[PDB]
Amino acid sequence: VKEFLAKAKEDFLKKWENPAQNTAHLDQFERIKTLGTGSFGRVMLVKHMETGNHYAMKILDKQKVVKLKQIEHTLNEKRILQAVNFPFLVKLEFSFKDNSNLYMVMEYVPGGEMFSHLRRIGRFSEPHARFYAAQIVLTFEYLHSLDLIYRDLKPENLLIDQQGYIQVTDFGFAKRVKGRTWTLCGTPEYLAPEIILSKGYNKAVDWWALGVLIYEMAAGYPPFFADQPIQIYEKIVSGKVRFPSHFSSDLKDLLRNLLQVDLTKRFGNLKNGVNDIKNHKWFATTDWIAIYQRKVEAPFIPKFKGPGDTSNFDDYEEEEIRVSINEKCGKEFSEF
């Protein structure tokens, strides 16, 4: 580990300092489907002719990014993403732009969203939830080790590859920070107390979000939910969590410490770092080395019926990709 992370720091740092650019053109890919849509962009399942491969292509509307004041976050996304590398992170093969858009061609994850599965299914057996947690756990070890705060963990963001493992996506809020940060962002239900209570915060929030994930993977629902955001933030800062009947003793334990409002007592931001997580009772059955090597027994193999199959993703009204005759946000994105 220690020996490993270092090597990884030098690798990341090298890519981070001289990040790639214009590694392809739109007209090199073939549009196929819209795997997801939102705020200022959409992600399509695309085919790359020259090699016949598939990739998901995140498309960002430069002007829609400027309006939502996300210029700085979009630059972080591409920069961090091309510089990073880990067994549970989507590879960013290509990235480019044109008069109207920003493009990030990622590796296709035929498995679909965790979210999609956890909802249809309902909840996950602790052995199944724990399998995923662990992965998110290491990934967070990797990320943090590089002075990186993910800031937007949520089922809607964890994909499942053929082997049945996690593929963290969406680095829209990923940021390389040493020390406190104030940027208020993320998804409500997973917001850390600090973040809502506008008091500056650090990685400690990536562990709180983690505890939230696990809870939702093992219970079927979030420990903090309601019909409107205010309501929810009010539940998080309240410091009152309620666990189901079927949550083992150990689990209720690990969760209590992660959903800790007191960040001088929150598992992860402590003196022993991430080992307080790797060495917890609820995790004893876990062989962290086996996981890193994708040699564990995937508790759920999402199967697809053929390359390009997309029966694991929901449907979205296909839209058009139009690029104005004029550059749109030149210097605002000059380094993408």
Binding site: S39, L68, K69, G172, T187, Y221
Partner: peptide, 20 residues
Amino acid sequence: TTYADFIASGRTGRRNAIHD
């Protein structure tokens, strides 16, 4: 049941992230 309350709630879909 909590699980029941959850499904009647309009937060059981893909949850969007908060910006500004």
